[PDB]
């Protein structure tokens, strides 16, 4: 994120890090529950990829993070790679995430929920802070 | 690429006014936000776009795409979870 | 769901 | 491809179609051998995805294509999703591809091969023929 | 999106002259081609970029990225298999 | 490898 601000460590508990076997942060996720991660189709996650829960400082060594494995990748069969439409993938964990003060779930909207233009929400990530 | 977790607030826009920027790229399963002096960027993808509903942060968007240069004056594009939740529900139930 | 144990200070 | 020309059916035999459970063509591949597919990391292939060999007309019903399954996704642990660098993924087939007049392998370069600017090569695909 | 398989020939360019177009986006594991009145496009990704070497078509590139509008005047970007082949070899051998 | 049974006509 560009022009963001550092967040309070663990104030955004469903926020996870998608990291390759190399330790490289390549995408983000959202813990919808202890057994499932929600991310973007286009992120091309594999079962060789790892799910990092309750981290804050990607470079901190004293963090009690949870490096959870991915049993299966359930890709929206309606993802259009040509247009990046229905850009969503589900992640099914091998090992259940241990919910805590810092590891918890996000809520999902009812297909029925309304969310008006002008409404101020929040995005979070370890995306480039600069172009 | 920040070691530190970032946060940002930004307005949610309509497709109509969003198409104003991205043209016929903005489809039904996409919701725009930003163009407010802040922007999601490379590495942010798959992460959450959350709106507080009735006391609780709800998953309304998934950082998908936008500006090649993560321009703060152009609206970032996100997956619309609401058109996808049915799929997600159906997916959990079976598995 | 969606109620952090530790509050975001925006 | 934009401004291409239709190719001779099966004249490009390592060319495969990456299709989701929905039948949707989302990426391409290259058969490097009967047990392995080479594609792009960014294509986000999953084991729910299918490998289509020896097809020509995505809309032809009289084609003797081979719909091969993906046992595992081996993603280049040096893929940078932030920059799309080392944009390569390997595909390990569950069922070996039956090589034929229309299904065969591509050659790989030696890390030692030279390929000069100005050299005319060939790209093939079912990518949008128009923007 | 064509039912029919397409083909196209195009010149391979140098990074230097390619950086001319794409700036500091062109990295070592990338090779440019096109900007010749033809271009790879959405759906082409992962497919082959082949050069005939000594009587045989060799895998020299993987359609990766380029122009948002698949402009025929801008060079498409491809993965450089040559910087990756070692990895591929190592990958097959073990599995 | 790389020698089609059926030749591309560019
Ligand atoms: C993803 O982080 C990004 C996110 C992004 C980039 C540029 C502007 C806004 C958002 N997306 C793409 C599609 O480049 C990731 F894909 F890089 F991982
Ligand atoms: C891929 O086909 C495309 C290929 C492409 C698009 C635009 C110009 C040149 C090549 N790539 C992206 C990165 O948009 C696929 F990703 F769509 F699948």
- Resolution rounded to one decimal, in angstroms: 2.1
Cβ-Cβ contacts under 8 Å between B and C: the total is 13
Report the side by side order of strands in the sheet with B56-65.
A5-6, B6-11, A120-125, B48-53, B56-65, B75-80, B30-34
Let me know if D57 is a catalytic residue. no
Of E4, E10, E77, Cβ closest to residue D57: E4
Produce one character per residue of B4-42: b if its CB has 16 or more CB atoms within 10 Å, e if not.
bbbbbebbbbebeebeebbeebbbebbbbbbbbebbbbb
B47 and A14 within 8 Å at the Cβ level: the answer is no
Q: What are phi and psi of E94, to 5 degrees?
A: -80, -30
Provide the token pair at E20: 């001319």
Domain B1-95, CATH 2.40.10.10 — does that match? yes
> A20 to each of A44, A52, A62, how far by Cα in Å?
11, 10, 21
Domains detected in chain D: 1-131 (2.40.10.10)
Q: Are the CB atoms for E59 and E89 separated by under 8 Å? A: no
Catalytic residue among B9, B36, B39, B45: B45
Torsion of the alpha carbons at A108, A2, E27 and A22, rounded to the nearest 10: -50
Neighbour-count burial of A26, counting CB atoms closer than 10 A to its CB (0-12 exposed, 13-18 middle, 19+ buried):
buried
Provide the token pair at B28: 């039904």
Pocket test for ligand 2, best of E39, E41, E49 (most atoms within 8 A of CB): E41
Distance CA B81, CA A112 (A): 11
Q: Are the CB atoms for D119 and E12 separated by under 8 Å? A: yes
Distance CA A17, CA A14 (A): 10
């Amino acid at each position: 994120i560009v022009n963001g601000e550092e967040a309070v460590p663990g104030s955004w508990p469903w926020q996870v890090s998608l990291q390759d076997k190399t330790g490289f942060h390549f995408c983000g996720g959202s813990l919808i529950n202890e057994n499932w991660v929600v991310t973007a189709a286009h992120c091309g996650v594999t079962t060789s990829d790892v799910v990092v829960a309750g981290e804050f400082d990607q470079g901190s060594s004293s963090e009690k993070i949870q490096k959870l494995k991915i049993a299966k990748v359930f890709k929206n069969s309606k993802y259009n790679s040509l247009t990046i439409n229905n850009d969503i993938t589900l992640l099914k964990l091998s090992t259940a995430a241990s919910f805590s003060q810092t590891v918890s779930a996000v809520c999902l909207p009812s297909a029925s929920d309304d969310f008006a233009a002008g409404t101020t929400c929040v995005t979070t990530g370890w995306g480039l802070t600069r172009y | 690429t920040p070691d530190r977790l970032q946060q940002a607030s930004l307005p949610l826009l309509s497709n109509t006014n969003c198409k104003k920027y991205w043209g016929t790229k903005i489809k039904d399963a996409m919701i725009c936000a930003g163009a407010s002096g802040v922007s999601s960027c490379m590495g942010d993808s798959g992460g959450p776009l959350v709106c507080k509903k009735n006391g609780a942060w709800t998953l309304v968007g998934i950082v998908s795409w936008g500006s090649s240069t993560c321009s703060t004056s152009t609206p970032g594009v996100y997956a619309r979870v609401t058109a996808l939740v049915n799929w997600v529900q159906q997916t959990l139930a079976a598995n | 769901c969606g109620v952090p144990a530790i509050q975001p200070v925006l």
